[PDB]
Enzyme design. Structure first.
Site, mmCIF file in Angstrom:
data_model
loop_
_atom_site.group_PDB
_atom_site.id
_atom_site.type_symbol
_atom_site.label_atom_id
_atom_site.label_comp_id
_atom_site.label_asym_id
_atom_site.label_seq_id
_atom_site.Cartn_x
_atom_site.Cartn_y
_atom_site.Cartn_z
ATOM 1 N N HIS A 93 0.896 -1.130 0.000
ATOM 2 C CA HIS A 93 0.000 0.000 0.000
ATOM 3 C C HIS A 93 0.973 1.226 0.000
ATOM 4 O O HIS A 93 2.041 1.168 0.618
ATOM 5 C CB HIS A 93 -0.811 0.096 1.317
ATOM 6 C CG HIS A 93 -1.632 -1.145 1.554
ATOM 7 N ND1 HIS A 93 -2.961 -1.239 1.194
ATOM 8 C CD2 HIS A 93 -1.251 -2.406 1.983
ATOM 9 C CE1 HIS A 93 -3.393 -2.495 1.493
ATOM 10 N NE2 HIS A 93 -2.377 -3.216 1.959
ATOM 11 N N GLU A 103 -0.222 1.828 6.140
ATOM 12 C CA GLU A 103 -1.518 1.608 6.822
ATOM 13 C C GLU A 103 -1.306 1.672 8.342
ATOM 14 O O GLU A 103 -1.894 2.502 9.067
ATOM 15 C CB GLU A 103 -2.030 0.199 6.373
ATOM 16 C CG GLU A 103 -2.299 0.222 4.921
ATOM 17 C CD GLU A 103 -3.381 -0.758 4.515
ATOM 18 O OE1 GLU A 103 -3.244 -1.966 4.802
ATOM 19 O OE2 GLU A 103 -4.384 -0.279 3.974
ATOM 20 N N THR A 196 -8.597 -4.465 3.652
ATOM 21 C CA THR A 196 -9.511 -4.105 2.579
ATOM 22 C C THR A 196 -10.761 -4.987 2.749
ATOM 23 O O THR A 196 -10.713 -6.030 3.433
ATOM 24 C CB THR A 196 -8.923 -4.471 1.175
ATOM 25 O OG1 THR A 196 -8.756 -5.917 1.064
ATOM 26 C CG2 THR A 196 -7.597 -3.770 0.932
HETATM 27 C C1 LIG Z 1 -12.644 -13.995 1.681
HETATM 28 C C2 LIG Z 1 -11.637 -13.409 0.741
HETATM 29 C C3 LIG Z 1 -11.189 -14.125 -0.357
HETATM 30 C C4 LIG Z 1 -10.259 -13.519 -1.193
HETATM 31 O O1 LIG Z 1 -9.820 -14.104 -2.185
HETATM 32 N N1 LIG Z 1 -9.833 -12.297 -0.912
HETATM 33 C C5 LIG Z 1 -10.283 -11.638 0.149
HETATM 34 S S1 LIG Z 1 -9.674 -9.993 0.472
HETATM 35 C C6 LIG Z 1 -8.171 -10.099 -0.480
HETATM 36 C C7 LIG Z 1 -7.069 -10.828 0.204
HETATM 37 O O2 LIG Z 1 -6.783 -12.017 0.006
HETATM 38 C C8 LIG Z 1 -6.340 -9.986 1.142
HETATM 39 C C9 LIG Z 1 -6.831 -8.703 1.367
HETATM 40 C C10 LIG Z 1 -6.173 -7.849 2.237
HETATM 41 C C11 LIG Z 1 -5.029 -8.297 2.876
HETATM 42 S S2 LIG Z 1 -4.181 -7.220 3.974
HETATM 43 N N2 LIG Z 1 -4.118 -5.654 3.231
HETATM 44 O O3 LIG Z 1 -4.897 -7.157 5.305
HETATM 45 O O4 LIG Z 1 -2.774 -7.760 4.115
HETATM 46 C C12 LIG Z 1 -4.536 -9.575 2.649
HETATM 47 C C13 LIG Z 1 -5.194 -10.428 1.776
HETATM 48 N N3 LIG Z 1 -11.174 -12.188 0.965
HETATM 49 ZN ZN LIG Z 2 -2.362 -5.141 2.603
#
Ligand SMILES: Cc1cc(=O)[nH]c(SCC(=O)c2ccc(S(N)(=O)=O)cc2)n1
Ligand SMILES: [Zn+2]
Length: 257
Positions: A93, A103, A196
């Site tokens: 990000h 973040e 997200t």
């Molecule tokens: C239930 C589900 C399935 C999917 O394929 N993506 C997501 S959100 C995308 C994802 O995998 C993701 C999103 C954010 C983060 S973060 N920015 O918290 O590291 C990590 C992974 N949710």
């Molecule tokens: Zn992230």
């Protein structure tokens, strides 16, 4: 629908994802004076020697470098974790300016960007089942400041013009994510969420204290990506970060001092 503009950014997400206002949302501000040193925390074990990167994808929000997670090849364990978490992807990000983009914040300091290495708990079999569990994911977060170049980042930067717009992917094999780690593995950790949508409360966050340095030219290339698809009006992919959320009833622990 959701994204990072005035009309569909973080301040709007709660209308489709009401957990946005939950009890263990991420990111947070890490108040370093009130984080508790926990001498029971273990060194983090980051075992990336056999990692298999496969592809890099502009998903319209960020770019993801994806890994083969069909066997125990790149895994995170120890630290605050019970059990073994497999690397599935990493992404960043970042800001429109060097003074914002992370973040997490540290005593309210924003960094120019933040890298997330996303791992899922193998006791749940796959990532889609893991995100529905409170201990399903472990995300290792690393701050980026602008200074000297990060030579292990340059392969990523140089492929970005091939994935400029939403939906584009490119083969991205043999990338070694050990080249993105700082020298020290000292960290803070706390229970939190995806940053997200869908904002699920499934993440043990492990945020390293030492940032890595990237050059101004490397982050400028991140800011040349686009949130839009090919053939659509250009919207530069910048400021794809969620601001700090209320800590609520949580305790951030430090592995050091
Ligand atoms: C239930 C589900 C399935 C999917 O394929 N993506 C997501 S959100 C995308 C994802 O995998 C993701 C999103 C954010 C983060 S973060 N920015 O918290 O590291 C990590 C992974 N949710
Ligand atoms: Zn992230």
């Amino acid at each position: 629908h959701w994204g990072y503009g005035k009309h569909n950014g973080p301040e709007h997400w709660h209308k489709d994802f009401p957990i946005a206002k939950g009890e263990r949302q991420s990111p947070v501000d890490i108040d370093t004076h009130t984080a508790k040193y926990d001498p029971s925390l273990k060194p983090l074990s980051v075992s990336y020697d056999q990692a298999t990167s496969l592809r890099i994808l502009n998903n319209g929000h960020a770019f993801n470098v994806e890994f083969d997670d069909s066997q125990d090849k790149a895994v995170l364990k120890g630290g605050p974790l019970d059990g073994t978490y497999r690397l599935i992807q990493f992404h960043f990000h970042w800001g429109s300016l060097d003074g914002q983009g992370s973040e997490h914040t540290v005593d309210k300091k924003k960094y120019a960007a933040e890298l997330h290495l996303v791992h899922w708990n193998t006791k749940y079999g796959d990532f889609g089942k893991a995100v529905q569990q409170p201990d399903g994911l472990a995300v290792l977060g690393i701050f980026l400041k602008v200074g000297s170049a990060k030579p292990g980042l340059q392969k990523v930067v140089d492929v970005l013009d091939s994935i400029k717009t939403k939906g584009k992917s490119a083969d991205f094999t043999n990338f070694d994510p050990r080249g993105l780690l700082p020298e020290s593995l000292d960290y803070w950790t706390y229970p939190g969420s995806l940053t997200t949508p869908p904002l699920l409360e499934c993440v043990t966050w492990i945020v390293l204290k030492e940032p890595i340095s990237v050059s101004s030219e490397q982050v400028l290339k991140f800011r040349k990506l686009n949130f839009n698809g090919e053939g659509e009006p250009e919207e530069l992919m910048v400021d794809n970060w969620r601001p700090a959320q209320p800590l609520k009833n949580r305790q951030i622990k430090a592995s050091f001092k």
